[PDB]
Write a protein that binds this ligand. Structure first.
Ligand SMILES: [Cl-]
Length: 262
């Protein structure tokens, strides 16, 4: 509706930043879009693509998720909540995937990136899926700079919604792999203040947040409303000031606006 568009515009104005929304409603194959073709820095929302690349690789290397990866002091970056516990030991690729997806661990992301061949390989995987918008240019932590006008490490809300739909509800991944992705995302610990905060308590959510420079605050989610077909929602947000603070509440408000009435 022009109603929903007006509400999103007013939220954006009040926030002072730039808001991007894409909702796919699988009940009726409809969408709600707001700046959905503009680019936004993905920040840690890109961890979904990296984990999915490893899951895809595992379809042809069935013991891949059990492969051990050394964690060293030299691997530590800016945010290592899980990896810091494993320094001087190994983690499996499954553990790294879970740590990336559920704790936003940046070492874990770097190991997933490295495993599959680097940012250009993650990007090539996206292309193979039919996502011609996504670009992963850098590793952690530099992929979070989120400078306005910089296309590095960006995607659009429309592209990311379509890709997340494919990964979680479609056929990008084999059934075992898809189920594993969904279970990981449903176990996320970082998203309660973001999309989830704008949805009824009873709804089931798998999500991946991101945050970075310029107050960039993101979330991408698969949502199972009570007795309804699932939704896919991307809410990307970024601000004019380099040191702007996080605005998870804007994501919650956008989620509430676009799901009101469902
Ligand atoms: Cl509620």
């Amino acid at each position: 509706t022009a109603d929903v568009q007006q509400k999103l515009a007013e939220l954006e104005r009040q926030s002072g930043g730039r808001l991007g929304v894409a909702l796919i409603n699988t009940a009726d194959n409809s969408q709600i879009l707001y700046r959905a073709d503009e680019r936004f820095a993905m920040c840690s929302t890109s961890k979904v693509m990296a984990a999915a690349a490893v899951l895809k690789k595992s379809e042809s290397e069935p013991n891949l998720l059990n492969q051990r990866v050394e964690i060293k002091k030299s691997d530590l970056v800016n945010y290592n909540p899980i990896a810091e516990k494993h320094v001087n030991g190994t983690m499996s690729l499954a553990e790294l995937s879970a740590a990336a997806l559920q704790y936003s661990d940046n070492v874990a992301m770097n190991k997933l990136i490295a495993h599959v061949g680097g940012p250009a390989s993650v990007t090539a995987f996206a292309r193979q899926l039919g996502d011609e918008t996504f670009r992963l240019d850098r590793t952690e932590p530099t992929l979070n700079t989120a400078i306005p006008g910089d296309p590095r490490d960006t995607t659009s809300p429309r592209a990311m919604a379509q890709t997340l739909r494919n990964l979680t509800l479609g056929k990008a991944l084999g059934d075992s792999q898809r189920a594993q992705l969904v279970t990981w995302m449903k176990g996320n610990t970082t998203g309660a203040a973001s999309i989830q905060a704008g949805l009824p308590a009873s709804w089931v959510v798998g999500d991946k947040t991101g945050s970075g420079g310029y107050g960039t605050t993101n979330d991408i989610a698969v949502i199972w409303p009570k007795d309804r077909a699932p939704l896919i929602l991307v809410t990307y947000f970024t601000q004019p000031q380099p040191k702007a603070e996080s605005r998870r509440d804007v994501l919650a408000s956008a989620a509430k606006i676009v799901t009101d009435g469902l």
